[PDB]
């Protein structure tokens, strides 16, 4: 085995495969070229016919009336020795130019973005620059570990050829890995853009390829399955914090004690179902209570009714007992296609079968032990939140506020901690109040509710585009959240090098872990300019487990004023322009 | 051997000496009418008429009042009511101006783009549908009849950097685009959403309603790949159902979305595969913004490189290509050739250069 000996053999194998695939494809492509030529012919003909119907009177030229000597002329010279041609020049007049803007997607809430290890583009700024100083491009590539798409000795690669190379690599090799780990390193060296090798390893598995899966309960293939398997997808994919599946803002999965619930309540006696209920001989309520009492530790004289249980029905039953805990009355009503007696029968049959600086917040789940100096929350120096799976009365949780009304002063414990109210904790002030009339007694919940003011886009009096407020606002009133992509400090540094060279960045610092980048997707407030004497300020508030940027009025603001805030730079990178008047 | 043969009958040079970035024959003129072509360079667009034999007659030349404006591209269309020819020019200032040469006046201007417009195209079937691609990473589709912005083709899966080129398919059902981001992105406009949006653009009248026209915003292409080229892609053309695109790789690549068998109209956005059918080899074209063109019947392909050499290929060739291309050089043509243009009949082949020169090449008798 040799580190360069794998690559050398890989390169040669790649050249050999590309050949025969192409030699074989030539037969097909030649067949496809003729077919494509047929499509070209038909469609060119259709366009050509449509041209015949049209009459355009083209080719006109004008000289008269004679030039008045106040018009400049256009001269064209010829190699043919024909005299030079001179024509009067017609001016194109007075079209206003719009400030420069690169396109961006709109956002109402921040968006989590993975780091990109290889930049797929070299910014073109430099032809007028004439490469100076070029060390910038060289240091820009340093940040990507020298990885640009696509920089490699080899020329072409595609999914079809890539699989064949891995297969040809496997057969080349003794046997068997069966699928080799050493090799993904070898080809990742030939392809810096494709690397890392583990990414290639995952991508190979993606292309190769249904166990383990649970088919549709609502399906022709429903199978009898344990409760965890039937819910495995909902538990594993749902986000407790923002209530969606595979959310855009929170990268980590279930804790997973968060989906586990209290066994209670209330284990009550309810009867009759009824009337075809699970009654009444010994072991109706008794054998049930006995079995669950026997299972927890660590009759039924009538013969059960003869019914057939579908895959879906059994799996649903196994699900429903987990959440209703022997209330067969309720299980049977929800299963719908069975009755309380039959649910009980099945439980009985089932029992007798034998099994064979600020840091971004994250919830903590150390189930029995308390939130002390080992708890990640206190390690991070952050409160535990409603999302934490610790004790109800954990000392490190933040209580809400009991405020009467606006709680926009230091007397509100929420506001004083630079936290917006909690709709689940601040039950007195109105953060929990009626959602639809979004203006409400609590004035510390604007970011959560997106109660942003109306903003107007127009050319700035200061620089490029600026943003203007339509209707006036009073001091410390909420204007808008500063939304954008959320990215790591490392990723922000790479994007920052290019933004600084370009001379403009939409970067905004969130906390130690993340930065908010309004460049690719963001919202209208992103156009707010810098000013040393601004009329607006920024608070990084902590909002329901998330850090969110809030833009507020530093002073009373009149209609149509342009909004500015202090960027907090050193700095002249590059403003340098505050302020007019 | 090789086809087809040309000889350089004339060469002419404009007075500003700034590069001519675009040249376009007016393919709209009826047969029996003289072959007209336009050139854009510096801050002016100039019109010339081809006359037998080797004579090129300077017809019209217009200049932008803004000295900073610099035109990059132009494209021909007509007003189907008055049947005039119409020429559109766009450039660095990101503004589209429409010249009507019969009236010799600028009738319309559109300034919605954020940055320079790299290329312009017109719908084959609809003369009012203008497609503009820009440095702001967006493509825009305009209805010049109602002065409405139909659609913006940028967003989450849009281009990450400058859009350098785009081309309609022959039928006008789909667009292919490319740019600095190394990616070629397919945008279908025969979808219900798009067909309806175009129709509503026509019905729009500002005197009838206080609302603005709602332009459709497409964030998602119907196919995308970065597996073809390894640098900026600056020219993409539709060859029937196949794609022709070039990079600073010294070859124009003919490829298609999907596996070999996959139909272009059965391509789903998630599709991972592309198939390369063949390459058109060339040399010494390392700078970006070097365009190739074809003739109307798409029998011949033409690309000028940066050292004043033009390459012409036969598109009826079976198998690579490989071999062979007809190369024509001239001892006074040494500057880079930004763009070429065939006349509607394949008789004439114009090429324009970095040094404000124009080169006329005629075919066999």
């Amino acid at each position: 085995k040799g580190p360069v000996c794998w690559r050398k053999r890989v390169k040669s194998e790649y050249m050999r495969l590309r050949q025969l695939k192409r030699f074989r494809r030539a037969d097909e492509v030649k067949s496809m070229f003729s077919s494509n030529r047929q499509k070209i012919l038909e469609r060119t003909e259709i366009l050509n016919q449509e041209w015949k119907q049209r009459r355009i009177q083209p080719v006109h030229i004008l000289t008269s009336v004679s030039s008045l000597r106040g018009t400049r002329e256009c001269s064209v010279t010829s190699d043919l020795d024909f005299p030079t041609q001179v024509i009067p020049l017609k001016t194109l007049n007075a079209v206003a130019s719009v400030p420069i803007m690169y396109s961006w997607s709109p956002l109402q809430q921040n968006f989590m973005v993975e780091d990109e290890t290889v930049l797929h583009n070299i910014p073109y700024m430099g032809d007028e620059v004439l490469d100076q100083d070029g060390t910038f491009i060289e240091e820009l590539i340093k940040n990507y570990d020298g990885k640009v798409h696509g920089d490699r000795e080899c020329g072409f690669i595609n999914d079809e050829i890539f699989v064949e190379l891995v297969n040809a690599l496997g057969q080349y090799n003794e046997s068997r890995p069966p699928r080799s780990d050493k090799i993904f390193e070898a080809i990742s060296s030939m392809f810096p853009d494709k690397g890392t090798a583990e990414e290639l390893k995952e991508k190979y598995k993606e292309l190769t390829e249904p166990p383990e899966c649970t088919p549709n309960i609502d399906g022709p293939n429903a199978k009898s399955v344990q409760r965890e398997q039937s819910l495995h997808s909902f538990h594993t994919l749902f986000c407790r914090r923002c209530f969606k599946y595979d959310c855009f803002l929170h990268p980590f999965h279930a804790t997973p004690n968060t989906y586990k619930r209290k066994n209670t309540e209330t284990a009550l006696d309810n009867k009759p179902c009824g009337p075809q209920c699970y009654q009444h001989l010994e072991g109706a309520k008794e054998f049930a209570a006995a079995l669950t009492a026997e299972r927890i530790k660590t009759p039924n004289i009538e013969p059960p009714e003869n019914v057939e249980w579908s895959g879906a029905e059994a799996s649903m039953f196994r699900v429903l007992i987990g959440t209703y805990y022997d209330n067969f009355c309720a299980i049977a009503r929800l299963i719908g296609t069975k009755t309380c007696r039959q649910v009980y029968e099945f439980r009985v049959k089932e029992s007798s079968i034998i099994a064979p600086h600020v840091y971004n917040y994250q919830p903590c789940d150390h189930p029995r032990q308390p939130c002390d100096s080992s708890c990640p929350c206190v390690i991070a120096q952050n409160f535990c939140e409603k999302f934490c799976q610790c004790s109800s009365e954990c000392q490190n949780r933040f209580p809400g506020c009991r405020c009467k009304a606006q709680c926009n002063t230091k007397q509100c414990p929420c506001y004083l901690a630079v936290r917006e109210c909690d709709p689940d904790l601040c039950l007195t002030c109105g953060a929990a109040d009626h959602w639809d009339s979004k203006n409400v007694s609590c004035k510390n919940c604007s970011i959560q509710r997106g109660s942003k003011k109306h903003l107007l886009l127009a050319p700035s009096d200061v620089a490029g585009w600026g943003i203007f407020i339509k209707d006036p606002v009073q001091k410390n009133e909420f204007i808008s959240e500063y939304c954008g992509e959320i990215i790591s400090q490392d990723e922000a540094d790479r994007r920052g090098k290019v933004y600084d060279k370009y001379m403009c960045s939409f970067l905004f610092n969130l906390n130690n872990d993340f930065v908010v980048d309004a460049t690719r997707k963001g919202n209208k407030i992103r156009f707010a300019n810098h000013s040393v004497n601004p009329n607006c300020y920024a608070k990084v508030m902590m909002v329901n487990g998330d850090h969110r940027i809030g833009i507020f009025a530093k002073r009373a603001i009149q209609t149509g004023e342009e909004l500015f805030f202090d960027y907090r730079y050193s700095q002249a990178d590059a403003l340098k322009y505050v302020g007019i008047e | 051997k090789c086809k087809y043969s040309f000889k350089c009958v004339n060469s002419l040079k404009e007075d500003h000496n700034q590069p001519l970035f675009g040249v376009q024959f007016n393919w709209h003129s009826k047969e029996g009418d003289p072959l007209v072509f336009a050139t854009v360079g510096s801050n002016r667009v100039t019109l010339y008429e081809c006359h037998s034999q080797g004579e090129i007659r300077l017809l019209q030349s217009y200049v932008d009042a803004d000295a900073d404006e610099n035109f990059y591209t132009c494209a021909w269309t007509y007003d189907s009511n008055t049947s005039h020819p119409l020429l559109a020019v766009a450039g660095s200032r990101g503004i589209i101006r429409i010249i009507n040469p019969i009236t010799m006046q600028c009738i319309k201007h559109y300034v919605g783009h954020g940055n320079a417009i790299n290329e312009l195209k017109f719908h084959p079937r609809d003369p009012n549908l203008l497609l503009s691609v820009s440095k702001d990473h967006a493509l825009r589709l305009w209805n010049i009849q109602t002065d409405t912005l139909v659609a913006i083709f940028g967003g989450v899966e849009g281009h990450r950097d400058e859009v350098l080129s785009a081309d309609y398919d022959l039928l006008g059902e789909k667009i292919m685009s490319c740019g600095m981001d190394h990616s070629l992105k397919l945008w279908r406009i025969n979808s219900k959403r798009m067909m309806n949006a175009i129709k509503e653009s026509y019905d729009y009248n500002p005197n009838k309603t206080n609302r603005p026209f709602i332009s459709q915003k497409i964030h998602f292409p119907d196919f995308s790949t970065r597996d073809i080229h390894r640098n900026y892609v600056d020219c993409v053309r539709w060859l029937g159902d196949l794609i022709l695109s070039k990079s600073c790789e010294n070859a124009i690549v003919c490829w298609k979305p999907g596996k070999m068998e996959d139909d272009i109209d059965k391509i789903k956005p998630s599709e991972s595969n592309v198939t390369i059918l063949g390459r058109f080899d060339y040399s010494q074209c390392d700078i970006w913004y070097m365009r190739f063109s074809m003739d109307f019947w798409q029998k011949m392909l033409a690309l000028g490189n940066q050292v004043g050499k033009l390459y012409v290929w036969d598109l009826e060739v079976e198998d690579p290509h490989k071999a062979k291309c007809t190369t024509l050089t001239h001892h006074k043509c040494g500057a880079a050739i930004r763009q070429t243009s065939f006349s509607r009949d394949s008789s004439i082949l114009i090429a324009v250069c970095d040094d404000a020169s124009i080169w006329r090449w005629d075919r066999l008798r």
Partner: peptide
């Protein structure tokens, strides 16, 4: 290597 491709020739 591969470098940033430029729009014009050196001279």
């Amino acid at each position: 290597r591969l470098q940033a491709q430029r729009k014009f020739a050196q001279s």
